[PDB]
């Protein structure tokens, strides 16, 4: 064989979909998330300590929230005859749920 084997665009994305939808393990690494939580909490109160399971719980909540958000965003995108999500889609979904910010 001469040329590298190359899948068309989109197929591997679909592979990623099925693979990650079958499983359940957390997708984000622990340590960066720990550092994020620690920084933000420090700006409210100093020298706080965190139990590991709390960090895990925040991780679960965040990932579930984001997943739901992307779901509604994708629906919004399809509604515009597009397949690419864009920031205004996210803004739209969030504005409809009331998660204004």
């Amino acid at each position: 064989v001469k040329k590298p084997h190359r899948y068309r665009p989109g197929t591997v994305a679909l592979r990623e979909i099925r693979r990650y939808q079958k499983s359940t393990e957390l997708l984000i690494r622990k340590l960066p998330f720990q550092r994020l939580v620690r920084e933000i909490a420090q700006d409210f109160k100093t020298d706080l300590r965190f139990q590991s399971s709390a960090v895990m719980a925040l991780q679960e909540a965040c990932e579930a929230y984001l997943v739901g958000l992307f779901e509604d965003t994708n629906l919004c995108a399809i509604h515009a005859k597009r397949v690419t999500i864009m920031p205004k889609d996210i803004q739209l979904a969030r504005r409809i749920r009331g998660e204004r910010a």
């Binding site: 939808q21 909490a41 409210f44 706080l48 929230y65």
Partner: protein, 82 residues
């Protein structure tokens, strides 16, 4: 070098999350907005968490504080007690 630490939420991980959400194709600009959105959510939760934390005159954040703060925002969470 560290980079405000929000950049620990990397591109490929966000891509993976979107994959779990049924997303196939993602623009380049999503990342920044997503990061901001994520930040907001965390902030609110932790504020409430720390508030519960401050009420007990404890210095150690416990899971229960997070669970309650989540419950009050209408995103009740199961699987870590109470």
């Amino acid at each position: 070098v560290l980079r405000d630490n929000i950049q620990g939420i990397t591109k490929p991980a966000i891509r993976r999350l979107a994959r779990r959400g049924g997303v196939k194709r993602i623009s380049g600009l999503i990342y920044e907005e997503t990061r901001g959105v994520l930040k907001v959510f965390l902030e609110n939760v932790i504020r409430d968490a720390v508030t519960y934390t401050e009420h007990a005159k404890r210095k150690t954040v416990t899971a229960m504080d997070v669970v309650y703060a989540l419950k009050r925002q209408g995103r009740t969470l199961y699987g870590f007690g109470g």
